[PDB]
């Protein structure tokens, strides 16, 4: 609050404050059959059934 | 120009990047799977350039050598490479040295019989040319058998990598982990015929994964005095197997030594051998037979080295 | 009725819902790009592993989150009446008899 | 990565009964015989070790037991049985299935042990197929060094007599259990009994004084929690050893020489291999364990 | 391969450099994420009326880290792989000169506090070292303090017995790797293996003639002829009958569950082999192996 009459503040104070991030683990598992990835896959780029 | 050659060599054998799928855009998910799949679809193919590729994946763990510093008298610059390694560490020396007894090295200071070792009998004389240059480093060759105090002394190193002898002071580099490599070829663990018993040779027990060797060094009397005698076997039937099948190789040491302490008892006489663990030999790998110069010596492949503790058997 | 009185003391559980109130942007959030790592080659099929690691950052300076009891749930502990018995705990502090 | 699966091809189509009981079974350790990938039923189980026509011997297959290669059953089909196996450190995933129940937590050890309670609840027949695949069972090592101390008791007194809630039963934490040593070789099982033989009649070959004395102090004068088996008669030898003096620097040698023969006892205390579990969760039974040999 | 312990106030100016010394240096905890408190690292679970098994045990069940770095707001660990090369310094407390190309072991601590733990007062939990000496020295400090806790038992009701002269010359002096070490001693960390060992000592010569007397017969295992001109006279002397059958057995299925769990807990191994030392830096390079 500003100056004057009667009223005497504890005039205007600044931190400095330093803080951590904190990490976090997520782990996931995805599973894919070895048929489907290699009939999608083919050195010869006919199209398909 | 000759600085752009190295970049292509650095550049060559870095470890494949991690695949980085980001799962917070729409197209970029879809353009970061699709390499996942274009890629282990030609990991699995048999050609030799999917077989080209396969290869750089590398989970290589690493030998870590210790190098050591032996007087030159000690130690022969005739040693087989592939030799395996002790540490005898009695006391503090006044420098840094150190004594390590290759096992026709510690031969000599042993002493036993050579009925027992006829061929590592005659060469462990003549490189020793008396074996007082061993015995006059060691003041207790009596006391330390007597007590049964001499396998706590000896800490297992691993084979013989580099030897670098000189006049009064002998480089020597071990492998105290995995296959050891030459300094390039890998240095496998190679034994005397002399001293390796066999327990998986008979007249059908499970093929497996590995195989081990273990280190024996038993207490006995030869000319009514404090001797010693190590061998080595090599098996992979479990631990309660072996210490229970080395027993029966030494029946006939055993009643020929309590004739004599049947007689007297002493507390310092009680204990009779010690097996250690020496390393690995995987399955099915035959050690080849060489000779030096005639001392049948088998090499061993891929032989990596552990460490067990001296365990006491009688 | 021996001339000393006693009290008497017992625990007890229980189950108990929540409310957690949030404020609004109290912490920012972060996104690693996530990496796949394979594992278990297997003929039939392969598994992936995606790791997303994420660093959390909390924001201006008080407490910016506040949890509350709310509605029970079951009690697990019984309130019944047992009492630890001494014997049990210290049978190396006896008696100097025997029988 | 690396590769590690064992695929088991049956020779002939499984019924759909004996499909149940394999199921049943998933995620559970058996040894076989050769580590490579395609494998013959008739080295899948321990049923080459644990026969029916004649005698199973307890010892022999669990001496048996440490030599193998240990696998973990995965998938059950009515053609093949698929199995990964077990790297000697690898973090791999296991469940309890075993049928005398006893739980598990995380940071316990475990030890695949033969089937000693019952020999008909862990053989299961394919008369499909001719084999008879033999689970081994899996128990934490607090119990499982006690049916190996209540089996080394047995070939004892069965000797000695030729009773049966002494000898046989293992007593572990509220309950009791009766193995199965009905019709069993014993050849074995005397031979670590007569190794027992050699290491017992040389720890009582120097025992130390002070530790005599200890007991006659407290035998009868005061109460310990373990020493209630000694009543109030001591023994008659241990006050016969009393009768000399006691001496420090002839004790040091009967304490270091007694040290050593008790590191020598874990050469006949064995279990098998050991698995320790670091995770663990009861909603599934389905712990995560880590593998060591030796 | 890192471990983040918070330390939600901030440190002493006397509890800082406390740290500052003992800045690597293996320490139990109790599981191996990192997200883990003051109260998780060290033996204050189970050291701060201490009992020897139970931590000897615990070693083997745990996953042992290093420290690397001591910062004001917090503390910074290292998870400690099996085979995995280290550097290790030399700072435990009392000092005992490791040698270069030995086996270090992990004991519990057995000594007094001031050597052992390190008070904190910014938290209110004080953390607990552990004792790592080489193999052959750690059960050379242990197999007298084991007979000076029996003395020290049997001059406490027969006085007479003891001579405290000849008692604090032998036990509290131990000679390795050719230099005598005084070690300190005002024990009931071992107050339990003096009850195993006493327990188990007057069984075993009851248990070798029940043993050898059951194994009578043709199919003899031929070495047990010579052990057993062995075993002294007046244990031969012994009157198995003066006991009965349902009694005798309890003096197997209690006598040799001593054998066991008093054998399996020397043979354990939290165990590390330093490969290359230097005696003025005190920094040791290894490599863990467990079990």
């Known amino acids: 609050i500003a100056h004057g009459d009667g009223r005497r503040p504890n005039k205007q104070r600044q931190y400095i404050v330093m803080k951590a991030c904190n990490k976090h683990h997520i782990g996931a598992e995805i599973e894919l059959a070895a048929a489907d990835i290699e009939l999608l896959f083919a050195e010869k780029e006919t199209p398909l059934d | ?314 | 009725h021996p001339g000393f009185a006693m009290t008497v003391v017992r625990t007890d559980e229980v189950l108990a819902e929540h409310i957690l109130y949030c404020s609004r942007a109290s912490t920012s959030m972060f996104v690693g790009l996530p990496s796949v790592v394979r594992r278990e080659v297997r003929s039939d099929a392969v598994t992936f592993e995606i790791t997303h690691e994420i660093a959390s950052l909390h924001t201006a300076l008080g407490y910016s989150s506040v949890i509350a009891p709310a509605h029970v749930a079951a009690i697990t502990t019984d309130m019944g009446v047992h009492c630890q018995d001494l014997f049990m705990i210290f049978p190396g502090d006896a008696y100097q008899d025997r029988q | 990565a690396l590769d590690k699966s064992i695929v088991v091809n049956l020779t002939s189509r499984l019924f759909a009964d004996e499909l149940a009981a394999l199921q049943s079974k998933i995620g559970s350790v058996l040894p076989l015989g050769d580590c490579h990938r395609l494998q013959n039923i008739q080295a899948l189980g321990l049923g080459c070790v644990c026969s029916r026509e004649t005698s199973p011997d307890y010892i022999q297959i669990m001496q048996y037991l440490s030599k193998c290669t240990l696998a973990v059953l995965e998938e059950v089909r009515p053609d093949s049985l698929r199995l990964t196996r077990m790297d000697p450190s690898d973090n791999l995933q296991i469940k309890n299935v075993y049928a005398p129940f006893f739980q598990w937590d995380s940071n316990t050890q475990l030890a695949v042990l033969p089937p000693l309670f019952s020999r008909k609840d862990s053989t299961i027949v394919l008369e499909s197929n001719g084999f008879d695949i033999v689970f081994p069972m899996v128990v934490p090592q607090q119990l499982g060094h006690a049916i190996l101390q209540q089996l080394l008791v047995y070939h004892i007194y069965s000797k000695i007599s030729a009773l049966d809630l002494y000898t046989t039963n293992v007593s572990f934490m509220g309950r009791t259990y009766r193995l199965d040593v009905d019709n069993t070789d014993p050849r074995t099982a005397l031979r670590v009994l007569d190794d027992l033989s050699m290491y017992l009649c040389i720890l009582s070959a120097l025992v130390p004084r002070g530790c005599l004395r200890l007991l006659t102090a407290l035998v009868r004068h005061d109460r310990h929690p373990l020493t209630e088996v000694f009543e109030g008669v001591v023994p008659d030898e241990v006050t016969r050893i009393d009768l000399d003096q006691l001496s420090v620097p002839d004790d040091i040698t009967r304490m270091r020489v007694m040290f050593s023969y008790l590191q020598s006892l874990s050469s006949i205390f064995n279990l098998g291999p050991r698995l320790h579990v670091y995770a663990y969760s009861a909603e599934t039974l389905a712990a995560s364990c880590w593998y060591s040999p030796r």
């Not at chain 2, 027992?116 to 480093?137: E, I, M």
């Open chain 2, 1 to 314: 120009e000759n600085a752009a050659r190295l970049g292509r060599q650095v550049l060559g054998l870095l470890p494949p990047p991690t695949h980085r799928v980001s799962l917070t855009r729409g197209p970029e998910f879809a353009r970061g799977v699709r390499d996942l799949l274009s890629k282990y679809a030609a990991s699995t193919r048999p050609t030799v350039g999917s077989l080209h590729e396969a290869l750089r994946q590398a989970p290589f763990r690493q030998p870590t050598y210790g190098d050591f510093l032996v007087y030159s008298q000690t130690f022969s610059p005739q040693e087989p490479l592939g030799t395996f390694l002790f540490s005898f560490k009695q006391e503090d020396n006044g420098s840094s040295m150190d004594m390590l007894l290759t096992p026709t090295s510690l031969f000599m200071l042993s002493g036993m019989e050579a009925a027992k070792a006829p061929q590592t009998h005659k060469v462990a004389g003549v490189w020793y040319g008396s074996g007082s240059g061993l015995a006059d480093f060691i003041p207790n060759l009596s006391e330390l058998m007597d007590t049964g105090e001499f396998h706590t002394l000896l800490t297992p190193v691993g084979p013989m990598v580099q030897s670098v002898h000189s006049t009064f002071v002998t480089k020597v580099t071990s492998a105290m982990k995995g296959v050891g490599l030459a300094r390039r070829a890998h240095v496998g663990l190679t034994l005397p015929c002399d001293m390796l018993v066999d327990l998986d040779e008979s007249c059908r027990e499970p093929a497996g994964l590995n195989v081990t060797i273990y280190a024996s060094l038993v207490y006995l009397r030869v000319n009514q005095r404090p001797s010693m005698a190590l061998t080595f076997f090599q098996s992979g039937k479990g631990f309660a197997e072996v210490v229970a099948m080395i027993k029966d190789h030494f029946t006939d040491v055993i009643r020929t030594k309590y004739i004599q302490l049947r007689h007297e008892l002493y507390i310092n006489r009680l204990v009779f051998g010690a097996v250690c663990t020496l390393g690995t030999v995987p399955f099915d790998s035959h050690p080849v037979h060489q000779s030096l110069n005639s001392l049948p010596v088998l090499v061993f492949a891929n032989f990596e080295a552990a460490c067990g503790p001296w365990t006491v058997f009688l």
